Design a protein around this ligand. Sequence first.
Ligand SMILES: Nc1ncnc2c1ncn2[C@@H]1O[C@H](COP(=O)(O)OP(=O)(O)OP(=O)(O)O)[C@@H](O)[C@H]1O
Ligand SMILES: Nc1ncnc2c1ncn2[C@@H]1O[C@H](COP(=O)(O)OP(=O)(O)OP(=O)(O)O)[C@@H](O)[C@H]1O
Ligand SMILES: Cc1cn([C@H]2C[C@H](O)[C@@H](COP(=O)(O)OP(=O)(O)OP(=O)(O)O)O2)c(=O)[nH]c1=O
Ligand SMILES: [Mg+2]
Ligand SMILES: [Mg+2]
Ligand SMILES: [Mn+2]
Ligand SMILES: [Mn+2]
Ligand SMILES: [Mn+2]
Ligand SMILES: [Mn+2]
Lengths: 683, 683, 289, 289
Amino acid sequence: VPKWIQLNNEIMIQKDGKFQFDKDKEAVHSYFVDYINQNTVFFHNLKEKLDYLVENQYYEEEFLSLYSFEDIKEVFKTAYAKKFRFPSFMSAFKFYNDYALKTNDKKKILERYEDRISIVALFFANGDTEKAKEYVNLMINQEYQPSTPTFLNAGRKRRGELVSCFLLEVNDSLNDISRAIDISMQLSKLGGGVSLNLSKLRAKGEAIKDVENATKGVVGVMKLLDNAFRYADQMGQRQGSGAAYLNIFHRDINDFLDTKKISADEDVRVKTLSIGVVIPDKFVELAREDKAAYVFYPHTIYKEYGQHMDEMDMNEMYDKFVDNPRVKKEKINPRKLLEKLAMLRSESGYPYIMFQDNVNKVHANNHISKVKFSNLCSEVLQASQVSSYTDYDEEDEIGLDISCNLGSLNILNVMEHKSIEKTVKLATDSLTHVSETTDIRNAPAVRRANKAMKSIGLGAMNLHGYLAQNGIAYESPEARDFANTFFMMVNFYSIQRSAEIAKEKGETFDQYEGSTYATGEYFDKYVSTDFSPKYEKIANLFEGMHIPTTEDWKKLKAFVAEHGMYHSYRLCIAPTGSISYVQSSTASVMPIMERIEERTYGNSKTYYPMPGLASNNWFFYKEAYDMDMFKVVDMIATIQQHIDQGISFTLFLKDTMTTRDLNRIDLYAHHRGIKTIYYARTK
Amino acid sequence: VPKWIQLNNEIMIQKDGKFQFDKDKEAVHSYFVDYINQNTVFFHNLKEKLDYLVENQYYEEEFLSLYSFEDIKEVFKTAYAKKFRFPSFMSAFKFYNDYALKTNDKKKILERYEDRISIVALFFANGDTEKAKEYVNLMINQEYQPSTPTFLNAGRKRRGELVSCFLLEVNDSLNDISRAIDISMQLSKLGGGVSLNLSKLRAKGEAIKDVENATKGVVGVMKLLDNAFRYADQMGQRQGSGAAYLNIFHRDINDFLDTKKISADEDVRVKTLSIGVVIPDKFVELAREDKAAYVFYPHTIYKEYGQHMDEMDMNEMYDKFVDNPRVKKEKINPRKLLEKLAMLRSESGYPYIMFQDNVNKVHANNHISKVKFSNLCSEVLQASQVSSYTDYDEEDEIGLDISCNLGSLNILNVMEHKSIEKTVKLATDSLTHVSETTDIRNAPAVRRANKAMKSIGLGAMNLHGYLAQNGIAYESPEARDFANTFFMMVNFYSIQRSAEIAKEKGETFDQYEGSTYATGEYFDKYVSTDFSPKYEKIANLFEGMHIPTTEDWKKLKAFVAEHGMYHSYRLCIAPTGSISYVQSSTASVMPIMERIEERTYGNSKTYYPMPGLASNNWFFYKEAYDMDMFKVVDMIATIQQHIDQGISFTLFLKDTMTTRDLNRIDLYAHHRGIKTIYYARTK
Amino acid sequence: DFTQMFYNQNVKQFWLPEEIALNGDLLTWKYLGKNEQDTYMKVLAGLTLLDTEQGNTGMPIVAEHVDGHQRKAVLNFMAMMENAVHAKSYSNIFMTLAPTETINEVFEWVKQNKYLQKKAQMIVGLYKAIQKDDEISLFKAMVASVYLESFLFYSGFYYPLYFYGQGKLMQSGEIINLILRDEAIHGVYVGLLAQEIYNKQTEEKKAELREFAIDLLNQLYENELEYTEDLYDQVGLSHDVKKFIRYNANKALMNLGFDPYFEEEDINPIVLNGLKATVEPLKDDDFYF
Amino acid sequence: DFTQMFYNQNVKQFWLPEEIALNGDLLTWKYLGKNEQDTYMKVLAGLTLLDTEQGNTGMPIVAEHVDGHQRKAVLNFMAMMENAVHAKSYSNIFMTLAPTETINEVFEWVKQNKYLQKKAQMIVGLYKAIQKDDEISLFKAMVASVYLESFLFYSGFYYPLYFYGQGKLMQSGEIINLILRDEAIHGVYVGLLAQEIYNKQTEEKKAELREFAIDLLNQLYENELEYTEDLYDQVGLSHDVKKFIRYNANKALMNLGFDPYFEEEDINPIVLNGLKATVEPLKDDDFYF
Ligand SMILES: Nc1ncnc2c1ncn2[C@@H]1O[C@H](COP(=O)(O)OP(=O)(O)OP(=O)(O)O)[C@@H](O)[C@H]1O
Ligand SMILES: Nc1ncnc2c1ncn2[C@@H]1O[C@H](COP(=O)(O)OP(=O)(O)OP(=O)(O)O)[C@@H](O)[C@H]1O
Ligand SMILES: Cc1cn([C@H]2C[C@H](O)[C@@H](COP(=O)(O)OP(=O)(O)OP(=O)(O)O)O2)c(=O)[nH]c1=O
Ligand SMILES: [Mg+2]
Ligand SMILES: [Mg+2]
Ligand SMILES: [Mn+2]
Ligand SMILES: [Mn+2]
Ligand SMILES: [Mn+2]
Ligand SMILES: [Mn+2]
């Protein structure tokens, strides 16, 4: 057992009835005195290091060639002047095991934290030394964290794509299904998580070229996609991850759900394909009134109306579908379906729940399309247009496939530096740069939507960490007040930066003129409701920072009207799995699952306390499972009212609560305006 | 139970110790006087029938519009003038259950045998009334039988494709793999059996752009193809059938074979994809000498030499592969691999065995490409060039994917009518028409190969029926002499018709100038060796027909040199599974499995005696399992010497014999020049 | 050719009653009508009573007369499942849903019931008639056993599967599904042992054994129709239950290597939702001819 | 007062030989002398024979004659363990360590070995002499069964335990310890049933039953001595094994409620070292907040 691992395991050993949290710090020192410095490759000067990394195909020549060597050296010096120290052993371990650049033999460390941050900053700035230094100060203060793809791969020649969330629309044809399989394989090859909408696909027992009972339904397509994702597994590094979304009014919805049951046969169950269910308000109304619902055959609806079932508003179309004899449908019990969803989420955490009307009643780009499905993490909610992939030697009709750009603000570090505006604007600029530098040659609709929509996702993390280190309970009304104010400022500065980029470049996102930004509707609740903190403690937390008022929001609305907005979507709160370790932050805006988490690496045990955990804030670091899920829903809705896309919202349940409690949480989330529900993790 | 069912079951009720074969005839009468005539749909005249079939989307109106109604009436009258009667109940039952056109609800019979034959003939003639009458006389005499796709689907609006088998070359890339999956689904949707050569795909543990041990090998692609064929299953009517072919020198050859082991795990086992193994002469030489062999990693060979492992001759490059340190290889025991092949064929009948050198030592189009794999029935052996399917928005390099149209001569009916020449020429014309009117819009390499190669497959059926009905034992040297003479005549007249078509159209198949037809090498054994019957009985059997001599072959060689050949490939002997029932013929050139076969249909059981089975020819209808497989190999080699493509050669084994006997049969087949071995069916 | 394979499948299906918590069924049980509760109780008691005969007599008597150590072991395992697992599982379901006095009364009723008794005693009669070293009498008992395992249980299984397919009584329905899965393999296995005896017989003796099997099936089937109406008319399900009986009768016949007796019918979708050749090395000179 | 706790203990002890990987014994087996391997194979073959008959005959026949569904369930479970688990485990050991010819030879050797045939003849004879409703014949068979469980197995168990205790053949030894753990509880249980019958008798009848038990033990003992010498003389252990079987004979007597018959002796210390979520429906009030 290594010395740093012993020093880390000494945390659980209680002295005077208290955990030895400070010992973790010592572990970090050991982890750097015994391992990191010994296995870190050192060079006589930075010029030699850069030459070795470029020549050995570690870095890219293009992004480094935009700067003189003096500017690169100045950026590296700015990164190293902070003298950044990892506060916990797990932060440094996760960085140097997951993100630090290693030799081809994987035994030496080529990149420190400062080196990786400097390289990512130089990639972000695209030739501006001052902008690169600003990015270096942003990331070394740990105010902003690029996502795992961006942080890991920026500036590296041997790399995947910087985007890892992809949403694909699948049209109801064999050509479109095969193209969707191909694109899923290509994007999993790039290292991205792929979500596919299967609602347009006709159900099982439908007609193919006017022969009856011929379609295999969406379950056969799910089997094909599951095989494709198993095959494309990042060159045998990570398990291929894919998601399939189906509307709850699709007839296959039960069989869809049956793919996640343990009792399902081998020809029914898909193991590497996550599933999500899109639930329109009509289904919730039918379940609430206990009226029996109807699941429709999509192809009959398409034949009758010329549009797909998921392309029209089910609230106004459901009665017409039911009363139409030419539309084929099957009787179901919506309450039984809700109970089945709750039971499946209890067993396996699936499916993801998308409340379609909750997403689309605040969607700014409904003119382009309504949000029909979400991503693999159930937080990307954007307009998508299906593509018509025709036969060979025939021109395809390329639509819009969602691929947003991830990046997370560290709420604790951002707010302690009183730099919400600067961090949000710099993160928006970096996300815009990464979106502009993304070029996928095997996903035509993804590339077209990236060029047109210019959608980015700016998330936040360390919400619970910040609240606990400031003596605020996550379920307290003060925490929701802080979340409201902080995320309203984040939205304000994100919109301001998007409008500034649109003014500078002279271009907005495609079909912006029809958006609620152009019409000013988006700013309605912002020009009438003041989002300043209602509690003195939160106001003192925001001291030293200008909180945008209704007049500031009116000025921003006028600015957007005059200049437009560059990004169709700006904010989405991703789970932030492993980057939260490196940043010493709690994951996403979720409450912490455990105060101290026990992990097993190799044959060794390691202990990670939550950041800033001590005896004084032990009670404020309440575990997520012990919390009331209604108050967690309230906080997530408070944040969601300022996020244009969704939030990865995992439910944290105890083994005691039943499926009725899960359904109640889901229905309260639907009532409170929650757009997506990610997971049902049972303790 | 139906009256005809009782009459057919009365065959096995012996009277005076003999089977009541004549009862079978009675059954057909019943089957027509109680079911077919009552279930048939009669019109006032042919005009009303044709109009009803045209407007109700049963028939394509284009092929019928090329004839005036008087000509169509004359063709139908020619078909009905023969007064064709089905001699066995099973012939009529199989036609009216599998090939006769029925209504949309399948409650009535719209097409008689004469109606189907007339429609197929009118489609074949393409506006020529005299040619349509010739086709009608050829098919109503049952001298020639179009394949099941062509016979069933010719002239139908709801038809599929007329091509039975498709062969795809899969290049070593994710884009090519995805395109192969798409094309396999498209062609299975069209109803054709798809064969894919996986020998170019790099083995398991190869590098995908400098990251090693990343590839899943051919087994992952096999699983993808298996799921694709499961999904595309002819709209749920016929199970999707696919074939995978791998060279025996591929490193994955064991894992490949492990897909068919009955103890294979679900993550490896493949159940809807047939497997074939391509064995060069080098492997047989290594096994014979007991020298340990080496299987190779295709990607290392491609990197070192710039060509795929199956793209070059292993007999001359195996030592270079072994001595090359930059080529990666694994040690295997070739005798152990042969024993594994024999055990697998005993257990499940797989893999198909393709003796590559036996195919390519007489292959006429080696300049275009060597034959690297076979079809799903292991009888199509043609040159194929792999396609380079590139990224989206990039032009693809379209290669040649094999596809040929099947058609079988009924040997008994052809020789009874003394019309080898006329039947062969008319069948060649019909297959040329089927190739010309075939246009597949989702398989580009298949379309290009169909347009360029113009390859057709003219098979033969009722070899054993003709031999047994003429008092010739199938294993006798007289039977092999008859096969030699008959198939030399078939080859002569097929080459003559191909050259005549090339002369009349002024065009040959692509790259004909480099073929052995153009250089005259193909005719060598035909201009030096006489293939006239060596037995007086066979010569009497061939009386009334001009058997080509060496002078006729020299004249044909000169004619080909002057005019060329329209078809790259002309003769391939398919299994002819279910259409042999309608023709009252034994399946293909294979010996009969059983004298009387008991088949269960619905809740009833039926007995089909072999065509012409009686007391005097009971022992001439020797069952295949009771026959010496070495003499069957001799027969198949004798036929194969006159067939440019392969023959679907099924091995018929007894349970008592061991895997060593199967290996001996395989090695004798390789020694005798057998190109492919189809199945190892054990009694 | 088959005993080791069935050994494997049997032992890997091993389970215990304690694995399924039953108490949560009370949350749907309380919402059923009196007729539904009555039918369920009666069906459950029917299954319990028949399965006890199979555990105490049916499986042990067949194990006694069958030759072969490996067959005796598989048969012992099946007898164990009847007595140690299935019987305890049925008791557990009862004790969860009804008070002691109600259980005693239902069993008193079903014990006196004419249609349950007719089939129970017909089966037991054939087990009692097996004679030492007489394979014909053993075969007849095996036919009876297959009819119980693969056919007679299913008029009963229908109802728990019907609830299970609707989301009602899910815990007891899971238990019933595990039991049913065991009886299915028991029926297939005993069926193969019966076919072995059948195949050793002359053609005349075979025809005679076929007539026996069909005659027995007919007697049991006509009583099943009466049993079915007696239990299921009060909940309106008899028509669909009858289709399920015939479908399972056909499976039982196929287990005995016989043709289906009844035409194919579709089954209630709610119930559906509930539901080596000898290796010889190459010796060289096999490559030369 | 005891069946339920034996039921629970038996079912919680359930195991399969496949749970234990045996390839780890390959080297310590290879290293034994030919004499040692021979004795080991033969010892396990003798055990296989005993379990074959205990599973096929002994346990099922006692189950048939003992009253009460729970008592029958325990006895049926024990029967299954004998032939479906114990007897089969020995073949798992044989198939790992020995080539087919050596396996074939040892099974031929059990058929012709006079001591093994004599002990089987005696034990199985008593099982087959049980008369329905005759408690005395049943008692005699239960004594025979206790002597098989708690005495006769031990001339065989000695050797795997002797190796296990030296750190040799430890995977095979793990299987044997599981078998031994089962037989110990089987011997106690059958012993308690035998005592039930004995306690119903007059003092005169009891005196005769003790005579039967002691005469039978002595007869089996004398045969086991010859068997032990035949197997163990070639490995030098016969005297040690004899002490072990006497020790276990006393345990068998105690299981029958009788006083120990042999004097205590020091046993080889090596051998001593060898020893779903709950579901509620949705109410209309759960849709409003
Ligand atoms: N907690 C930590 N986080 C990150 N790096 C660390 C940490 N502890 C030590 N290191 C690394 O090890 C070096 C030694 O640091 P130490 O605590 O011994 O003193 P120092 O004054 O920071 O040293 P130096 O002269 O290297 O700057 C640091 O410069 C840094 O590179
Ligand atoms: N074996 C058969 N094959 C094909 N069609 C048959 C067969 N048997 C009967 N039919 C059909 O059923 C009709 C019944 O007539 P059948 O053969 O009994 O003799 P028919 O009334 O004297 O006239 P004909 O033989 O001249 O048609 C036939 O005309 C024919 O259309
Ligand atoms: C992407 C991917 C490829 N492969 C294998 C199958 C293909 O035959 C083979 C080639 O993939 P390619 O698509 O050719 O990958 P590449 O072009 O980026 O890499 P290279 O330059 O080396 O050609 O890699 C996998 O096994 N799994 C995968 O996920
Ligand atoms: Mg379409
Ligand atoms: Mg490539
Ligand atoms: Mn049972
Ligand atoms: Mn049973
Ligand atoms: Mn035992
Ligand atoms: Mn025991």
